[PDB]
Amino acid sequence: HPDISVDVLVIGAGPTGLGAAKRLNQIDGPSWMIVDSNETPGGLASTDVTPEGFLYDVGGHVIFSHYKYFDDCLDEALPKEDDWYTHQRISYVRCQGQWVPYPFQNNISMLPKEEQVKCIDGMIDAALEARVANTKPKTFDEWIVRMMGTGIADLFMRPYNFKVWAVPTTKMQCAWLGERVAAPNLKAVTTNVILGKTAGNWGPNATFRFPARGGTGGIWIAVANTLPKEKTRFGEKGKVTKVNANNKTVTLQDGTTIGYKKLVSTMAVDFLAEAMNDQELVGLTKQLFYSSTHVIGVGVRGSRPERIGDKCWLAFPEDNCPFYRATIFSNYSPYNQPEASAALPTMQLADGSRPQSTEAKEGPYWSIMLEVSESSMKPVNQETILADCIQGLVNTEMLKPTDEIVSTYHRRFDHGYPTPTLEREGTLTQILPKLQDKDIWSRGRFGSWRYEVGNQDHSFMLGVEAVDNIVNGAVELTLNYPDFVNGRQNTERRLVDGAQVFAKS
Amino acid sequence: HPDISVDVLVIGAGPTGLGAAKRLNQIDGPSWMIVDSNETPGGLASTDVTPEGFLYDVGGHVIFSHYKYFDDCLDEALPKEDDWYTHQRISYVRCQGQWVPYPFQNNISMLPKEEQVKCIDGMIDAALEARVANTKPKTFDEWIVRMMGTGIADLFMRPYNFKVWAVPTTKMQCAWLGERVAAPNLKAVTTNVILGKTAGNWGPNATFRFPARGGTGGIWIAVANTLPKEKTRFGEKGKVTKVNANNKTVTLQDGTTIGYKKLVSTMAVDFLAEAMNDQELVGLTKQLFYSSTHVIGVGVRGSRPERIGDKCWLAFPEDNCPFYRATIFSNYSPYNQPEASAALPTMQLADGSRPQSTEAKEGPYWSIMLEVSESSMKPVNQETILADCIQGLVNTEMLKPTDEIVSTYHRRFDHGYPTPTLEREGTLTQILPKLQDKDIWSRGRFGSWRYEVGNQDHSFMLGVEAVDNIVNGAVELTLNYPDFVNGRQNTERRLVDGAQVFAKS
Amino acid sequence: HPDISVDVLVIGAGPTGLGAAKRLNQIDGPSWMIVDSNETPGGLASTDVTPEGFLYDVGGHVIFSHYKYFDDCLDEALPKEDDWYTHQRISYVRCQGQWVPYPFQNNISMLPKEEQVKCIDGMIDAALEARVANTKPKTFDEWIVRMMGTGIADLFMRPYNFKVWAVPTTKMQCAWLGERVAAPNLKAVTTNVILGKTAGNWGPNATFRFPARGGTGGIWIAVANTLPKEKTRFGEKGKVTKVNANNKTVTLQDGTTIGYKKLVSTMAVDFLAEAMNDQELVGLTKQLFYSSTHVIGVGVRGSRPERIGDKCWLAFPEDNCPFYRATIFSNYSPYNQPEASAALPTMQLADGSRPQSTEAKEGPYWSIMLEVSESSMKPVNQETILADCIQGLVNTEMLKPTDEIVSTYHRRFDHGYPTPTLEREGTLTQILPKLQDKDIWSRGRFGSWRYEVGNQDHSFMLGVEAVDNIVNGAVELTLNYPDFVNGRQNTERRLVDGAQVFAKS
Amino acid sequence: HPDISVDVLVIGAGPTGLGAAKRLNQIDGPSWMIVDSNETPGGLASTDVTPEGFLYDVGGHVIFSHYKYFDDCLDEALPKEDDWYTHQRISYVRCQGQWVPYPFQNNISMLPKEEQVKCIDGMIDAALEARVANTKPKTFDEWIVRMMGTGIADLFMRPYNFKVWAVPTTKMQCAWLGERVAAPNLKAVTTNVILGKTAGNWGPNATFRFPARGGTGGIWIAVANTLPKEKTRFGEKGKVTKVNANNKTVTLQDGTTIGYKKLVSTMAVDFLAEAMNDQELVGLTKQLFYSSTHVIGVGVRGSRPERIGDKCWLAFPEDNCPFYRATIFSNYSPYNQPEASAALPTMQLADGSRPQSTEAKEGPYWSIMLEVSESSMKPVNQETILADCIQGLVNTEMLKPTDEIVSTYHRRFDHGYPTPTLEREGTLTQILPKLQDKDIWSRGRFGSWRYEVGNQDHSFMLGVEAVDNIVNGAVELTLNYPDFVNGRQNTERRLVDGAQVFAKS
């Protein structure tokens, strides 16, 4: 007999695992426990801090919630108004010396007129083709060209998405983008070109909220803190090293054994196959594809430059920089970096020069967070990527050569993005049912490998819905029907359901 | 203080109400109670019997289940293999002196060649138009013509559906038919014409099961028998006369008062509004439309004629009979009519004349069940409808003039079909949320008025999912997303979920 | 026996009649003669002069020749380089305070940005419709909208063409515009809008030549002068009053009778029917439709204004003036108006006021020629049309209020344009072959009533080809195939053919 | 100084040259003469006879006249009713053991049903493609598939046209086929399939007339006999060996020189280029492509077999015979073969057997004329082609193994068909203008190399129109606008025009 026995065991305390725990804790029926190899919950939604006091998320993390249940739990975890800062969803694309408002195609009036003509001509071709289209696009690349036409595709979405996914657009499926017809809004595009107009897809009602303190990781620490501590096991003491699917037993690194009736696993499914010593599953999961993520952080001395302003995140299709995305992380919360009175020495100038003085000087400070993707199709030199990012900051005119860098950060995350390859579904529909047959719910960004339901709210809810399926026979909608859950506000499931109301009576 | 207080009150013990009761009974959390004005549960899924021993459902009732939960409850209710008879889904269209296998358009090779030419010419027009179509059809009629072309539309779906819905096809929406593109399968249709081929949409894997005894009503009696009797109130004692939504109180005909926290109402929503004495709701529910259904039963002396054979149900576009559908109800179970040894006198010949003998004679017997629709747009002479139906049987060569009729049945059901009018949804999105705000879940064939989720299984699950929404915060998928539930095997929810398993341990 | 007998009699000595005469003279086989009621040949291609010395054509006459034969005869008639002035085909559309280069749609960058948006949106609609179009347009209006889209149609071609044709665009056929598919060049139109480009359809290789002296009428006087005088009868002595088609006899006003073997009639075909005393034909010709042309001429003191410049003709869609076309006739030849030293008193100012003195002042002078259409669908108040035109010149900023008018001209031409109505071809097929069967070739702008072959070169060649059909069995290509002759350089037929080269040898 | 001088020299007395001569003779203006290397006029429209008395044209020659002038000359040449036999245009396609009436696609009901399905499915694809097509086909093959769809294309037009043209369909242009849109008449094809109908494109309307005596060649002998003998030079006496274009001199084989002002050359333009000793023209003409024609004639003993009946000509797509076309030449005139009382020995049976008796026996006789094409892409073994043709007659069930052959004929015509290659126009538009600049009108089947105007009437009229261009400045419509002349009734030009009527006065 095992050291511990529970009805439902949850492996991992990122958002998905925490969702499973929150729903299990609410239901308060079957016995359960959650484990994690990290002492701090949060997974890829955690936050680091440099010795100089600059916080960095695991790349740009902006919350858009499709679910009231998610909202309930974040509200519970961080209930005060000053626990959060609200911002508009302000983003741009760097192109040919310009900050072009997203969406790119509605703002090409900023480009040279000859380029506008080529763009519009290509979109006219796409519009005429779409009028007689009777097939769906099969690849991400086809989807892009049918939507934008060749000229606009070539300027932004084609080169940008290679930099993001670290695979060519021709090697990815497009079903993950949803049911919308791949067709241009030619009138919208020509109208803004004709009016010489720019317009971003943000405004007073297109906002996100960010935690005042501790970065995105602050949320998940706070959510985890609402759980009964004795049902959690976080740290080296919580590291899973072996899963015996046949005996429904998990072994931890310290030798502790846990018996389960149902297993919710949120570790990367390729790690799970290895932990299970299941050769067939190892083979299948190796057919999946993922990219790694390099997160680079740069802390800069000075008040926020006017050229930066209220920018939140920034997309980079061009090859004068290695990152695909920059986030003005200092814009998300004043507590993502030190206060202005904090004294820090200049480490280097943005052009690589040594500072004139080694003396600690005061702020204020601002902060840029960068992401560079890596895969077998897109190698990254770990030894030079930081310097290359900083040079890229000068090339893109985010930093002047003279700007004073007072903190740097670089961390590589092996499993960064689960890639929507052409082969993904053919592989997943072999893996997930085999795991299911063994009473294993493998769920999450790399637990079930579907990027289109791979944000914090989707992950949280994948855990919630897995538990609801286990206990109440609910449909796992987020898992199997991304278009469904993303196309509605999911309002029915709440942190207090009828069940708990009636029980308290 | 009311006489009785429960957390959830269920009004009606047709399939919807019994669904709610079954789920409540399973969850075994909130207190509940179910009432019906009829001593016998089943509603429109009940069965009558004539004094001569011939059973009749409320028109043709053939089960196709989209849900494992529904299967579980029928299996529990009637667990023995001999509780059921299995049949292939054999149906035909009566057209120009012939029985044309369904689907009609795949079988027009049976028609005169000149008529085939007109049919194919019409479908070629429809295919060519479909090739450049960039709008969705807005009416049932438009949908029909885009699918079939004019010729085929005029032969079957146009005149048949007026006979069915008692409103013209131009006055109905078409969303209720699903998301499939309205376009002809020209190749399939021309291929069968070229090959001189007929092919029905049935076979060994296209079957239905029917209760051995008591007709369809036998199911719902048996399902209801699994509920705790003290939580049921069926008959005059269970007739709801008044609903006070603000007090959350229901008053029964015998004066009994019931307080509720949540109400699941499965009576027709126009009747609920009246019982609520809510004039705004009364006004809104009067914007809905329904047809009445006349059910006519004819019991016939003789072994089953070869011309009838294994036919199950039959559709009648033509004017030579008033019914839209006939069911060979004696093919569904041998216990739907008397045994051969039963002595019964002939009441009349099918040609309407008196029998030569008044003497009771033996069987065997077979049985025809007919449906005639009625609305304000399609009046029916009730005084002559039995005789008209019987002459219709002679006109369509179902009965010979000399066939001996030993039993007749006629009953009018006021609320027969909830009509998918163009106006339906605009009206329902005013009614259903207004009731919802008052903690009233109005659900079912006329509880929520959506035909596309209006069969026995849909109805049962509307009740189940309403309770699940009330208690566990489930999405009411059947109610709000008919295409979703009808397009998949719904397997997740079971009569025994993890909750019951874990609690029993 | 008649007073005169010829093989071929030509009625009318406008361009069509003169063409027949020239070919007859060249062939020099069958006997012939030509008559006209006017002492001066030229018909609608004649020129008037005011008592103050200002010439006016019958509205704007610009020669574009599709035929070498026509060139040969014009070269023969006016062989000197200084007999002609060459100009580029410079024309504009007046729209919203702007002179917009023709073609209008390539030049809408001159309009406000909001007008550009409306124009391009409309043309986008037309492009998408054209992509799936499988029918030809049936009316001029349909043709226009398919070519231009609604916004551009509404700004120019729709209102302009009513002002031109004196019938709505919806009442005219569109085959006369040729076989080019009615579809927009969206790329060309958007490209010029994006680039902020204008471009007229003229240049060094898009020119016309205009007679140095005597206006357009000088040409036909000179052409007629090359004919043997004794084969002409021009003036009251040449006025046809009766045509007896059965006797093949023509009676002139002075009583002279002419017997013919073949008749080439170039008078308006409705006049011919009357002269034939043929009630059936009269009835048919009354089914045809034509507009009348008011020609207004305005002579102005001053050197040519900068705002006018090298403009040749101008189109006016807007309702701030009654004319559809203005011609800067003083730009066509310096001899279309008096020399600068000629003394003329001011008749009125452009604002309508009287001048101070009767003092004759010198020039220089320039000259505007206007056209206003009239029909039963579009009446013209003859008493005020001169004053209305002059106010139109002020409204359109062609004349300043203070500009000094030194000469005015107004003349109404009853048969101005033969209208391409929907009914035209159906009526002509009943008329022209009936005349043909009587050895009457009715040809010309109103002889055969086809505007698309109704210019001077077309008309001349209708006369030439009729004779060629009569004598040499040639196809009448201009008459029956406008698209054919207008889409090629017709080079084969010359004023000296092999026949004459060989004969002289 | 040349031996003879004429205004117009005509080389060749096939139909083109005779057209030129007839029009020259009619005009009776410029002096002229016509020469041919053959003592008998007719060119490829001539007729041979075997020593046994069987006539053979140069393959199937069926007249369809597009011109009144052509009709006039044939009527003049052979004015008696009994100079001609009239027949309906009866033709079939040999396919899979069946004689399928032309047009093939309207008669595929004769094929197996499974094959009808494949044909109709292919034509449905083509119909749906044609609905959204926005480009013209560029090759004969693309045109075929767009008209017929793949299945029908593969059965007849694709293999047949290779056997006809001796080049693949992918190597030919399709403009020569005319302006009709390449698109299926799907309804016509499905209608006949559904009705089980066969229908040929012939009837009392669709007829041809064939000369009573001398074959097609009798026409051209008779036409030539209307020319003044002294202006003709036929035989070795008239063989052109050299054309000196710069001196406008022709040299004949006997040394006679002829000076001309204008040359109408109807010899093959590649021979002309050689005769001109013009290396540039030789190079260009070698870029043209042509196929050779083998004509095989078989005289058969017996009354006309029932299986043959009234068939006129027959097309052979399949590879069980080398010929592409068979003509029942004995159906064209009773005088194409000996009378029944003429005695002839059997040469062989159709299966190659020796006859039982060597004795002369009587008829009646019938007669088959066959065509086999040859090119560098499709060699023909001249030593075996007769035997292979005869075996082909057995294979196609035209002859029984027992049928008695009493006469055979084989002749190879080097220039048979001018090929409408993709390259043809690019080459001709270089050749013909250069010849034109030297006053050489090269015209005819190989004079101007355009098959679509390469029949007897087209050829005749090319000659007529060249003369008309030389003398009267006529447009050469047949040469430059095949679509124009083939799409109309050309009635204007007559053998007696006004010019001759007036002159006789």
Coordinates of C-alpha atoms in Angstrom, one line a residue, chain A residues 174-475:
Chain A
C174 CA -4.8 26.9 -39.4
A175 CA -7.9 25.3 -37.8
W176 CA -6.6 26.6 -34.5
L177 CA -7.3 30.2 -35.6
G178 CA -11.0 29.5 -35.5
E179 CA -14.0 29.3 -37.9
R180 CA -13.7 32.8 -39.5
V181 CA -13.5 32.7 -43.3
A182 CA -10.0 33.4 -44.6
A183 CA -10.9 36.6 -46.6
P184 CA -9.8 40.2 -46.6
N185 CA -11.8 43.2 -45.4
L186 CA -10.7 45.1 -48.5
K187 CA -13.0 48.1 -47.8
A188 CA -11.6 48.6 -44.3
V189 CA -8.1 48.5 -45.6
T190 CA -8.5 50.7 -48.7
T191 CA -10.6 53.2 -46.6
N192 CA -7.8 53.8 -44.1
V193 CA -5.3 54.0 -46.9
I194 CA -7.5 56.6 -48.7
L195 CA -8.1 58.6 -45.5
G196 CA -4.5 58.4 -44.5
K197 CA -5.8 57.1 -41.3
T198 CA -4.3 54.9 -38.5
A199 CA -6.5 53.0 -36.0
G200 CA -5.5 50.5 -33.4
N201 CA -7.7 47.7 -32.1
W202 CA -7.9 49.2 -28.6
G203 CA -9.9 51.8 -26.7
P204 CA -11.6 52.4 -23.3
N205 CA -13.3 49.0 -23.5
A206 CA -10.4 46.9 -24.8
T207 CA -8.4 46.5 -21.6
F208 CA -6.5 44.1 -19.5
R209 CA -5.7 44.1 -15.8
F210 CA -2.3 43.3 -14.4
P211 CA -1.3 42.5 -10.8
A212 CA 0.1 45.5 -8.8
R213 CA 2.7 43.3 -7.1
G214 CA 4.8 40.2 -7.9
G215 CA 4.1 40.2 -11.6
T216 CA 1.8 37.6 -13.2
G217 CA 3.2 35.1 -10.7
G218 CA 1.6 37.1 -7.9
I219 CA -1.9 35.9 -9.0
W220 CA -1.0 32.2 -8.8
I221 CA 0.7 32.5 -5.4
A222 CA -2.4 34.2 -4.2
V223 CA -4.8 31.6 -5.7
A224 CA -2.7 28.7 -4.3
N225 CA -2.8 30.4 -0.9
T226 CA -6.6 29.9 -0.8
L227 CA -6.1 26.1 -0.8
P228 CA -5.8 23.9 2.3
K229 CA -2.0 23.7 2.7
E230 CA -2.0 20.1 4.0
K231 CA -3.4 19.1 0.6
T232 CA -0.4 20.6 -1.2
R233 CA 3.1 19.4 -1.7
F234 CA 5.4 21.9 -3.4
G235 CA 9.2 21.7 -3.8
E236 CA 11.7 18.9 -4.1
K237 CA 9.3 17.0 -1.9
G238 CA 6.7 17.3 -4.6
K239 CA 8.7 16.3 -7.6
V240 CA 7.2 13.4 -9.6
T241 CA 9.8 11.0 -10.9
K242 CA 7.7 7.9 -11.7
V243 CA 4.1 7.2 -12.8
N244 CA 2.9 3.6 -12.6
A245 CA -0.3 3.8 -14.7
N246 CA -1.1 0.1 -14.2
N247 CA -1.1 0.3 -10.4
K248 CA -2.3 3.9 -10.3
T249 CA 0.7 4.8 -8.3
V250 CA 3.0 7.9 -8.5
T251 CA 6.5 7.9 -6.9
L252 CA 8.1 11.2 -5.8
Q253 CA 11.8 12.0 -5.8
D254 CA 12.1 11.5 -2.0
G255 CA 10.5 8.0 -2.4
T256 CA 7.0 8.9 -1.3
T257 CA 4.3 6.9 -3.1
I258 CA 0.9 8.2 -3.9
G259 CA -2.1 6.0 -4.9
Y260 CA -4.8 7.7 -7.0
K261 CA -8.2 6.7 -8.5
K262 CA -8.0 9.4 -11.1
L263 CA -5.0 11.4 -12.2
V264 CA -4.9 15.0 -13.6
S265 CA -1.5 15.5 -15.0
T266 CA -0.4 19.0 -16.1
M267 CA 3.3 18.3 -16.7
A268 CA 4.4 18.3 -20.4
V269 CA 2.9 15.2 -21.9
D270 CA 6.2 14.1 -23.3
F271 CA 7.7 14.2 -19.8
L272 CA 4.6 12.2 -18.6
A273 CA 5.3 9.4 -21.2
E274 CA 8.8 9.2 -19.9
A275 CA 7.7 9.1 -16.2
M276 CA 5.3 6.3 -17.2
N277 CA 8.1 4.4 -18.9
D278 CA 5.6 3.8 -21.7
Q279 CA 7.6 3.3 -24.9
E280 CA 4.6 3.6 -27.2
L281 CA 3.6 6.9 -25.6
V282 CA 7.2 8.1 -25.7
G283 CA 7.3 7.4 -29.4
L284 CA 4.0 9.2 -30.0
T285 CA 4.8 12.3 -27.9
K286 CA 8.1 12.6 -29.8
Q287 CA 5.9 13.3 -32.9
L288 CA 4.7 16.5 -31.2
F289 CA 6.6 19.7 -31.8
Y290 CA 7.4 22.6 -29.5
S291 CA 9.6 25.7 -29.4
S292 CA 11.7 27.0 -26.5
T293 CA 11.5 30.5 -25.2
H294 CA 14.4 32.8 -24.3
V295 CA 13.2 35.6 -22.1
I296 CA 15.5 38.6 -22.0
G297 CA 15.0 41.5 -19.6
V298 CA 16.6 44.9 -19.8
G299 CA 16.3 47.5 -17.0
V300 CA 16.9 51.0 -18.2
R301 CA 17.6 54.2 -16.3
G302 CA 15.4 57.2 -17.0
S303 CA 11.8 58.4 -17.2
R304 CA 9.8 56.6 -19.9
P305 CA 10.9 58.0 -23.3
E306 CA 8.2 59.7 -25.4
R307 CA 8.9 57.4 -28.3
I308 CA 7.8 54.5 -26.0
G309 CA 4.8 56.2 -24.4
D310 CA 1.9 54.0 -23.5
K311 CA 3.0 51.0 -25.7
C312 CA 2.3 47.7 -24.1
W313 CA 3.6 45.1 -26.5
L314 CA 5.4 45.1 -29.8
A315 CA 5.7 42.7 -32.7
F316 CA 8.8 42.4 -34.8
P317 CA 8.7 40.8 -38.3
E318 CA 12.0 42.2 -39.5
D319 CA 15.4 40.6 -39.2
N320 CA 17.3 43.5 -37.6
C321 CA 16.4 42.0 -34.2
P322 CA 16.2 38.4 -32.9
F323 CA 13.1 38.9 -30.7
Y324 CA 9.6 38.5 -32.0
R325 CA 8.0 40.4 -29.2
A326 CA 8.9 43.2 -26.8
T327 CA 6.9 44.2 -23.8
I328 CA 7.2 47.6 -22.0
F329 CA 6.9 45.7 -18.7
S330 CA 7.4 48.9 -16.7
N331 CA 4.1 50.1 -18.1
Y332 CA 2.2 47.1 -16.6
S333 CA 2.9 48.0 -13.0
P334 CA 5.0 50.6 -11.2
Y335 CA 6.2 47.7 -9.0
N336 CA 7.8 45.7 -11.8
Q337 CA 11.0 47.7 -11.3
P338 CA 12.6 49.7 -8.4
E339 CA 11.3 53.1 -7.2
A340 CA 13.0 56.2 -8.5
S341 CA 14.9 56.7 -5.3
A342 CA 16.6 53.4 -5.6
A343 CA 20.3 53.7 -6.4
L344 CA 21.8 51.5 -9.1
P345 CA 25.1 51.7 -11.0
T346 CA 25.0 51.7 -14.8
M347 CA 26.1 48.2 -16.1
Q348 CA 26.6 49.3 -19.7
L349 CA 25.3 51.6 -22.4
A350 CA 22.9 50.2 -25.0
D351 CA 25.6 50.4 -27.7
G352 CA 27.8 48.2 -25.4
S353 CA 30.0 51.0 -24.1
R354 CA 31.2 51.1 -20.5
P355 CA 29.6 53.8 -18.4
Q356 CA 31.6 57.0 -17.6
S357 CA 31.1 56.3 -13.9
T358 CA 30.7 53.2 -11.8
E359 CA 28.8 55.1 -9.1
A360 CA 25.2 54.1 -8.1
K361 CA 22.7 56.7 -9.3
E362 CA 19.0 57.1 -8.8
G363 CA 16.2 56.4 -11.2
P364 CA 13.5 56.5 -12.3
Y365 CA 13.7 53.2 -14.2
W366 CA 11.8 51.6 -17.1
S367 CA 11.9 48.0 -18.4
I368 CA 11.8 46.0 -21.6
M369 CA 11.0 42.3 -21.7
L370 CA 12.0 40.4 -24.8
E371 CA 11.1 37.0 -26.2
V372 CA 13.3 35.0 -28.7
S373 CA 12.0 31.6 -29.9
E374 CA 14.2 28.5 -30.5
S375 CA 13.7 25.2 -32.3
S376 CA 15.6 22.7 -34.3
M377 CA 14.6 24.8 -37.3
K378 CA 15.8 28.0 -35.7
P379 CA 18.9 27.7 -33.4
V380 CA 19.7 30.3 -30.8
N381 CA 23.3 31.1 -29.6
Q382 CA 22.8 31.2 -25.9
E383 CA 26.1 32.9 -25.4
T384 CA 25.4 35.9 -27.5
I385 CA 21.6 36.2 -27.4
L386 CA 21.6 38.9 -24.7
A387 CA 24.0 41.1 -26.5
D388 CA 22.1 40.4 -29.8
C389 CA 18.8 41.4 -28.1
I390 CA 20.4 44.7 -26.8
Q391 CA 21.7 45.5 -30.3
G392 CA 18.3 44.7 -31.6
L393 CA 16.9 47.3 -29.2
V394 CA 19.2 49.9 -30.7
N395 CA 18.3 48.8 -34.3
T396 CA 14.6 49.1 -33.7
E397 CA 15.1 52.5 -32.0
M398 CA 13.6 51.3 -28.7
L399 CA 16.9 52.3 -27.1
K400 CA 19.3 55.1 -28.0
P401 CA 23.0 54.1 -28.0
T402 CA 23.4 56.3 -24.9
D403 CA 20.6 54.7 -22.8
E404 CA 21.9 53.3 -19.5
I405 CA 21.2 49.7 -18.8
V406 CA 21.1 48.9 -15.1
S407 CA 19.9 45.3 -15.1
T408 CA 19.9 42.4 -17.4
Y409 CA 18.0 39.1 -17.3
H410 CA 18.1 36.0 -19.5
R411 CA 16.4 32.6 -19.0
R412 CA 15.7 29.8 -21.4
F413 CA 12.4 27.9 -21.0
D414 CA 12.6 24.5 -22.8
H415 CA 8.9 24.0 -23.3
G416 CA 7.7 27.4 -24.4
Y417 CA 5.1 27.0 -27.2
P418 CA 3.2 23.9 -28.2
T419 CA 3.4 24.2 -32.0
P420 CA 0.1 23.8 -34.0
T421 CA 1.9 21.7 -36.7
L422 CA 0.0 20.0 -39.5
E423 CA 0.6 16.7 -37.7
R424 CA -0.4 17.9 -34.2
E425 CA -4.0 16.6 -34.1
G426 CA -3.2 13.2 -35.7
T427 CA -0.8 12.7 -32.9
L428 CA -2.9 14.0 -30.0
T429 CA -5.9 11.9 -31.0
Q430 CA -3.6 8.9 -30.4
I431 CA -2.0 10.1 -27.2
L432 CA -4.9 11.6 -25.2
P433 CA -7.3 8.6 -25.6
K434 CA -4.6 6.1 -24.5
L435 CA -4.0 8.2 -21.4
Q436 CA -7.7 8.6 -20.9
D437 CA -8.1 4.8 -21.0
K438 CA -5.7 4.6 -18.0
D439 CA -7.8 7.2 -16.1
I440 CA -5.2 9.9 -16.7
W441 CA -6.4 13.4 -17.7
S442 CA -3.4 15.0 -19.3
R443 CA -4.3 18.6 -19.6
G444 CA -2.7 22.1 -19.9
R445 CA -0.5 24.1 -22.2
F446 CA 1.8 21.1 -22.6
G447 CA -0.4 18.6 -20.8
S448 CA -2.7 18.6 -23.8
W449 CA -0.6 20.7 -26.3
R450 CA -3.2 23.0 -27.9
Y451 CA -2.0 26.6 -28.1
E452 CA -5.5 28.0 -29.1
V453 CA -6.6 27.0 -25.6
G454 CA -3.1 27.7 -24.0
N455 CA -3.5 31.0 -22.2
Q456 CA -3.9 31.3 -18.4
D457 CA -7.7 31.3 -18.4
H458 CA -7.8 28.3 -20.8
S459 CA -5.3 26.4 -18.7
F460 CA -7.0 27.1 -15.4
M461 CA -10.3 26.0 -16.9
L462 CA -8.8 22.8 -18.5
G463 CA -8.0 21.8 -14.9
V464 CA -11.4 22.9 -13.7
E465 CA -13.3 21.1 -16.5
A466 CA -11.1 17.9 -16.0
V467 CA -12.3 17.7 -12.4
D468 CA -15.9 18.4 -13.4
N469 CA -15.7 15.6 -16.0
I470 CA -14.2 13.3 -13.3
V471 CA -16.8 14.1 -10.7
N472 CA -19.9 15.5 -12.4
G473 CA -19.6 14.0 -16.0
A474 CA -19.2 17.5 -17.5
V475 CA -18.1 18.0 -21.1

